[PDB]
A paper describes a structure:
Tripartite motif-containing protein ([name])72 (mitsugumin 53; [name]) has been determined to rapidly nucleate vesicles at the site of membrane damage, but the underlying molecular mechanisms remain poorly understood. Here we present the structure of [name] [name], a complete model of a [name] E3 ubiquitin ligase. [name] is a member of the class IV [name] proteins, which is the largest subtype among the 11 groups of [name] proteins. Its domain organization includes an RBCC domain followed by a PRY motif associated with a SPRY domain identified in splA kinase and ryanodine receptors (PRYSPRY) domain.
Author numbering:
A (entry chain A), B (entry chain B): 85 to 258, 263 to 470
The structure:
Amino acid sequence: HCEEHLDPLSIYCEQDRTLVCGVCASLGSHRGHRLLPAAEAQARLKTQLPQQKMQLQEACMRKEKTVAVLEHQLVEVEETVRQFRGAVGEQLGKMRMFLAALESSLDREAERVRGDAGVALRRELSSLNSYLEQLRQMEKVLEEVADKPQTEFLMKFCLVTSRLQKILSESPPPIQLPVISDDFKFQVWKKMFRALMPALEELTFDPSSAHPSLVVSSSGRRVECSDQKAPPAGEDTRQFDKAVAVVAQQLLSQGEHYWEVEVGDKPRWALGVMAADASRRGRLHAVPSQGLWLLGLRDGKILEAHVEAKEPRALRTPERPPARIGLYLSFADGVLAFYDASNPDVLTPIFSFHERLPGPVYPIFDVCWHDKGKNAQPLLLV
Amino acid sequence: HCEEHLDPLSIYCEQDRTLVCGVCASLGSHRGHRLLPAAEAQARLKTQLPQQKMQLQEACMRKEKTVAVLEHQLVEVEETVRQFRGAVGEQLGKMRMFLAALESSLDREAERVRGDAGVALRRELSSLNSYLEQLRQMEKVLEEVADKPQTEFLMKFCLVTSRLQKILSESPPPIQLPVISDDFKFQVWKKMFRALMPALEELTFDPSSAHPSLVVSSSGRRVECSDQKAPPAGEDTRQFDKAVAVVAQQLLSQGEHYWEVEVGDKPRWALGVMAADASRRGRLHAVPSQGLWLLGLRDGKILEAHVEAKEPRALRTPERPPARIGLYLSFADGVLAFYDASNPDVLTPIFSFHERLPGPVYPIFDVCWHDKGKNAQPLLLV
Ligand SMILES: [Zn+2]
Ligand SMILES: [Zn+2]
Ligand SMILES: [Zn+2]
Ligand SMILES: [Zn+2]
């Protein structure tokens, strides 16, 4: 069955992977090569089948896992796509809607003022029309009196003479016009930069860490400072001895939150933002690298900002002392907002940390000591 | 006909303003009073009518003119109402639509990105599906290989094994995922302060007052400096002798307008406001009382704004040399806007005078002399 040597090729030449016969395995192209039988050949096929099966199935598992991961990250990618589509719509919604609603409100206010003015002026026109009607009727009666029967025409003059003089003595009585201008666009856009702020939030205090220097009352809504007496401190798990302070109960140190408060002008102090990575005792110069950022104020006009560095920083004096501060917190890009809005309709920023040190802070604040009662400004909500 | 003296009442008692008769004027209530003949009384009526006619008609004129003036201011009130509603709509449209156009552009960008990601991963998954189909088809030879004649089943293994190994080995390696974040506040405010721009303006030069030292070309939009020579040419109203400068022909001192310009790197210069109602001769002795305010910079970094007074005012020293400036003009309150936009999507303000000086200005600006060729930088528009 060799077709040239007539032996059924029944020997494997593992040196040459060749099916061979007597002469084919003895000489020719396989003069000194290896010879294997066909029963051992089938046996070795049966022996090497399982590992090749396992290789096939493991490659299939690899590619199946790859496809599954590709489609899973596809659904996650489109989940992010749709979610940010909806979030973008949300942002537009808030801002655009607020602006449009306020504009419609101003439109109805102007319409109401115009309607009131129109009603008043229509009443005035009705009064003057009644005056004119009286004039016309009395003058036609005057024409009659002039050209009516002789004797009584000679008589009747004095009534109308006196009435004319008296109604001339009846003197008719002898304004609020706020029209727009071109600066309104610009100042309204300034007010929109103010209006970037969102709505109110959940507001409750927590007087737990109150060192006996300040005072909190009104169901934990009103907080101010005074000097009742001078008792030493008292400590709890996270309280302090010399660094008087007070916290708020809400603690959601991720995502974004916001609200506004007022402080005003206070004689002298230093305060800032606090994280657990540093010391908490005394009025020492704390290193903001360990989560204690400082900023001191005197004269309601002079601010020195203890830098993320060695010594304090100077701040250029503003054109007006500050009045009110709004706070906004988020942690995706070190989002920290603490800005002054002297009136709640205007806004210019102050500063921010452009470096990204997360340093999870704790909501807790305090102002420096009274020093004979010069440091008593309050705070509330809403 | 007296009913008490039986005399037809024919005497007026002007002493008692009483129409009486003969006996009534002789005795009774007018025993020694004044007497009028009553024929002359009818004559007095006919004679004295016209002046009282004029008085009553003047009262009617007062009423009519008062009503006319009130109604004229009424029509002006409703004209203002409708017109400022329309103007409010004009602003609303401009700003809101502009911003919406940008967000829609971002929407198309997001849709295209989603499509591109889908296309790439669809191509890869289709290739992998073809791979898996090939794997299954090649594995299907299982039945024949297991139960077919001995010899060829012993033989045919090698090249199919090698092809399987190659197609398993050729795995292509691959995240570019720009989803929104919380820095949206800062970057979106940058781009919204960019989108604040109203439309462009008509900008063309006028080389009539060009002192022959520098050169302007590119259809009167590009301007630069060189020194062929410096001869003082024939001079006109707004030409110069040593303080080289050149003006523009356009003068539209009404409405509101805006445009963009570039500055680049220049050694030292000065700028402010100049009007044609004052001098233009020599080294520009500018009178800030007449709307010619000066403000000087040197070293490319230091600017001081000279008021018409003893101490000029300081500007906090900036962090960066200027790149590009945008200008905006309006005439309701001396509205002057000059802000730095290094790239057209970023913007930083400088300052402004809140006072209202109409002061019809002349459009012209200029830099100091070449001074060793350091001041030979060109300028164009956007
Ligand atoms: Zn043979
Ligand atoms: Zn061989
Ligand atoms: Zn009588
Ligand atoms: Zn009398």
